[PDB]
Nucleic acid binder design. Structure first.
Ligand SMILES: [K+]
Ligand SMILES: [K+]
Ligand SMILES: [K+]
Ligand SMILES: [K+]
Ligand SMILES: [K+]
Ligand SMILES: [K+]
Ligand SMILES: [K+]
Ligand SMILES: [Mg+2]
Ligand SMILES: [Mg+2]
Ligand SMILES: [Mg+2]
Ligand SMILES: [Mg+2]
Ligand SMILES: [Mg+2]
Ligand SMILES: [Mg+2]
Ligand SMILES: [Mg+2]
Ligand SMILES: [Mg+2]
Ligand SMILES: [Mg+2]
Ligand SMILES: [Mg+2]
Lengths: 217, 83, 141, 183
RNA sequence: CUGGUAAUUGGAAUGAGUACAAUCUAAAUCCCUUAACGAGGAUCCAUUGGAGGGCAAGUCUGGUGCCAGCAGCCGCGGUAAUUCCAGCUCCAAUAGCGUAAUUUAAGUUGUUGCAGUUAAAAAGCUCGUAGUUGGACUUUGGGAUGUCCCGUUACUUUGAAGAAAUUAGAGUGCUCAAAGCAAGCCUACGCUCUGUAUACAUUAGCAUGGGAUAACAUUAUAGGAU
RNA sequence: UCCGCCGGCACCUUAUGAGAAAUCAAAGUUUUUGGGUUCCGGGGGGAGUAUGGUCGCAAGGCUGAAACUUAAAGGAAUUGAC
RNA sequence: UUUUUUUUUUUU
């Protein structure tokens, strides 16, 4: 079946780690997609966003390969992006799905004004940049919906954000850079220091230290 | 972040750099967490007791992690009677 | 860098006013040259057919695009107008009365037809579309 | 001066920004078929009304809670939504206005109500019955399927007293057949 | 039992039309109401544009063969054309749809908010008047309790006043709606004093509180204050 | 010869910065956009042309259009071929 | 460091 090759994979298969937030807290790299499948696999959905052909010139013509862009998300604060290039479309799509699973990140959602109910928009103004494409997200009031193009709109929908205002500059017709800028903007949500985070951090044992004895075998 | 009722709403509370106060993100693989063990009157390590320091990738890439950690440990040892 | 003085509103307004002329769309609609063009700022114009002309298609295409030389009644200017649809040139004759419209690109050539900015809409008071579909008949006189 | 010129009028719908969204087309066709609408214009008109109401509610929610304008207009809007059955008594906050969908407004159509109470075998049957003057709301005959029924008037829906299904005087077809059978 | 199709069968419904009549109307007409008629291929026969991509919809069939033509753009057509001319089928809107100045998209006029090394771009260099811009410094605190103790302007707060119509918006079942300013109870020889609210409104002017940030003027030949 | 301070022409390393990159320790501190101020660009051609003015002995300089035409022209970098 | 000019139109 699955034979983990990493300490994190062993812990996830042994049920020692039960939530993706435990891994996110210590910023540990995730190198096996079975970890994500076990943790949040049931609620994850995938979608192929674009199949892009690329060509390399050779002495005997053009060698064509296909680029697959895949977005995964649970619609509840987790989203991932995957890009893979392969000779066959199916292989590229499979690799892109694996990479999108491996890159899932937590998305912070906040309130525009009054803080009643679940969060509905981005906590603050965030901006992402890939290549020349820059994507800006602005908090929006409840009921405003997702005001974004179809690619950013899909990325935001997979992240579970209910309403947001967006603006884009640059070559947004470069779909890869557009989606990557949106992904970077979403990732930057948890890096902004707000007054609610001013409390002193109270550290907890890392999984590799907490379960060192188990991993010692 | 909390609701009007008072319920915790955030997915998790990220750690903060012990020196720069920056938020340590999930994909920050240059960040480290260190435990400094405490010693009794006989210079023997007391299991389970230590001071924890976290450093973000930004400070470590700058080369300032060493001096910052030295200063933080000096202050914490002075406070904790570890000499 | 930009000027930012609180008392520098006049300079900002004047600079924008001067720089607007670098905009081609703004200059087209503010130079008052539309009145010297064949249509003189109109959507359509009537004219008389002078001669049928064939225009070679641009590369990489190869065809003979059928057009008519039309003199506009209201100012006497001469233009080239495309005659669309198969065999629709047979409904056009010299000295016929034709209604002329733009080619859709606001005074610029369309497709593989070089230097043609107009098309025929009606001939002798009957739309070319009706003639092509046999809905109507071209008046005998 | 022509006094008729002073009468004012306005549009009731807008065309979609993107004509050929496949998902939008599928959803719209599903709604139209479910509610038996004649064209996409009716759905777009309902969407226009819903958007106007939601925009008003969103504008009000931006003002201070103690703002007299917010109080007055919010009470007016909540009363309007309660009168037409869009919102329930428990749904007594402007926030619940933002949670209103096109289906909520469509469920208040006289056609949908006539189908639901059982006077029609299908939504299309309800449509043809309404447009054929077989239905009355109170004592007034109504032949407009888009008629929005208020909560108070919902229980008064009945067959027209001058129609075969509500009174006497059968239709012309039945009378002709009876006359033919008399020989 | 549950759904979809059938120019197969079966009876029901109805308005387009038609027309007594009444009603409407200055008089007519229309609308509303309504005797007698008015539907099965319900011939009482829905159209305008499309079907390579943008952009929803055929690697269907016949013809033409870089021709004729299409094609806003990219491109189709050279003898196996999803793109032309047609048939069939399909797609979008629908009693509407196609085609030929101006707004958005345009952060491609950028004050908010663009650019200037190589994409278009900083004058060859310096001086310099108009213009724009211009360092710091002058009364803080406590005791108490809004109150007591130790020259000219910009700017901001508040108020008045500032036609209607239009815009926003309260109420109101013109059968609904666009509307309109109506109208509702009960049939009392009447009533609701029935309603016909409210908001918005650059700059400039008028009046008022504040004195932080700013601008202009003044300072010592004392000819100064008292 | 050694250690320092100020000012200057430059160089090397590095990214926590920027950038379409090439590269830049200023081309940084920019959608988390605002220190002051001058000039100046708005797809490619027609064209630095026509016309008017002005300076110059002349050559020409400065100022400087339009009609019309067109779907690219162009920047950096990658692979191949040469 | 002698000399070495040229390759119709569309498309693959
Ligand atoms: K040619
Ligand atoms: K061709
Ligand atoms: K198309
Ligand atoms: K053939
Ligand atoms: K053939
Ligand atoms: K086509
Ligand atoms: K050709
Ligand atoms: Mg399609
Ligand atoms: Mg064929
Ligand atoms: Mg065809
Ligand atoms: Mg630009
Ligand atoms: Mg150059
Ligand atoms: Mg240049
Ligand atoms: Mg130069
Ligand atoms: Mg000068
Ligand atoms: Mg230009
Ligand atoms: Mg030669």
């Amino acid at each position: 079946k699955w034979v983990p090759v990493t300490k994190l994979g062993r812990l996830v298969k042994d049920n020692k780690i039960r939530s993706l937030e435990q891994i996110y807290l210590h910023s540990l790299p995730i190198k096996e997609f079975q970890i994500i499948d076990t943790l949040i696999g049931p609620s994850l959905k995938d979608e192929v966003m674009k199949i892009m052909p690329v060509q390399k010139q050779t002495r005997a013509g053009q060698r064509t390969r296909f680029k697959a862009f895949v977005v995964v998300g649970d619609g509840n604060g987790h989203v991932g992006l995957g890009v893979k290039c392969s000779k066959e479309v199916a292989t590229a799509i499979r690799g892109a799905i694996i990479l999108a699973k491996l890159s899932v990140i937590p998305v912070r959602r906040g309130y525009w004004g009054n803080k009643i109910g679940k969060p509905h928009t981005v906590p603050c103004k965030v901006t992402g940049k890939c290549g020349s494409v820059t994507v800006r997200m602005v908090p929006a009031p409840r009921g405003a919906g997702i005001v974004a193009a179809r690619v950013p709109k899909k990325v935001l929908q997979f992240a579970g954000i209910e309403d947001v205002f967006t603006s884009s500059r640059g070559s947004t017709k470069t779909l890869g850079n557009f989606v990557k800028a949106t992904f970077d903007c979403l990732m930057k949500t948890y890096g902004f220091l707000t007054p609610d985070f001013w409390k002193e951090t109270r550290f907890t044992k890392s999984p590799f230290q907490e379960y060192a004895d188990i991993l010692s075998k | 972040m909390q609701n009007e009722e008072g319920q915790n709403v955030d997915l998790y509370i990220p750690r903060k750099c012990s020196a720069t106060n920056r938020v340590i993100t999930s994909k920050d693989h240059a960040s480290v967490q260190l435990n400094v063990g405490h010693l009794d009157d006989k210079g023997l390590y007391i299991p389970g007791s230590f001071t924890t320091f976290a450093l973000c990738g930004f400070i470590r890439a700058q080369g300032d992690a060493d001096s910052a950690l030295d200063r933080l440990w000096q202050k914490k040892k002075v406070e904790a009677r570890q000499q | 860098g930009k000027t930012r003085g609180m008392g520098a509103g006049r300079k900002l307004k004047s600079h924008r006013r001067r720089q607007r002329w670098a905009d081609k769309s703004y200059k087209k609609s503010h130079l008052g040259n539309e009145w010297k063009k064949p249509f003189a700022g109109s959507s359509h114009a009537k004219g008389i057919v002078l001669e049928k002309i064939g225009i070679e298609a641009k590369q990489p295409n190869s065809a003979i695009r059928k057009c008519a030389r039309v003199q506009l009644i209201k100012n006497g200017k001469k233009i080239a107008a495309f005659v669309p649809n198969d065999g629709c040139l047979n409904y056009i004759e010299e000295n016929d009365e034709v209604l002329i419209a733009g080619f859709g690109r606001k005074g610029h050539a369309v497709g593989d037809i070089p230097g043609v900015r107009f098309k025929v809409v009606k001939v002798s008071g009957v739309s070319l579309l009706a003639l092509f579909k046999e809905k109507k008949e071209k008046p005998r006189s | 001066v022509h006094v008729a010129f002073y009468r004012n009028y306005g549009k009731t719908f807008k065309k979609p920004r993107r004509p050929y969204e496949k998902e939008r087309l599928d959803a719209e066709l599903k709604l139209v078929g479910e509610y038996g609408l004649r064209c996409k214009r009716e759905l777009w008109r309902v969407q226009y009304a819903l958007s106007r109401i939601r925009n008003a509610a969103r504008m009000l929610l931006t003002l201070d809670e103690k703002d007299p304008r917010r109080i007055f207009e919010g009470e007016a809007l909540l009363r309007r939504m309660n009168r037409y059955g869009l919102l329930d008594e428990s749904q007594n906050k402007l926030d619940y206005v933002l949670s209103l969908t096109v289906e909520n407004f469509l469920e208040r159509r006289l056609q949908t109500l006539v189908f639901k109470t059982g006077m029609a075998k299908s939504i299309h049957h309800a449509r043809v019955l309404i447009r054929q003057r077989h239905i009355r709301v109170g004592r007034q005959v109504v032949n407009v399927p888009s008629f929005m029924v208020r909560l108070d008037s919902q229980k008064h829906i009945d067959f027209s007293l001058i129609s075969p299904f509500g009174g006497g005087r059968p239709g012309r077809v039945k009378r002709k057949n009876q006359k033919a059978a008399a020989k």
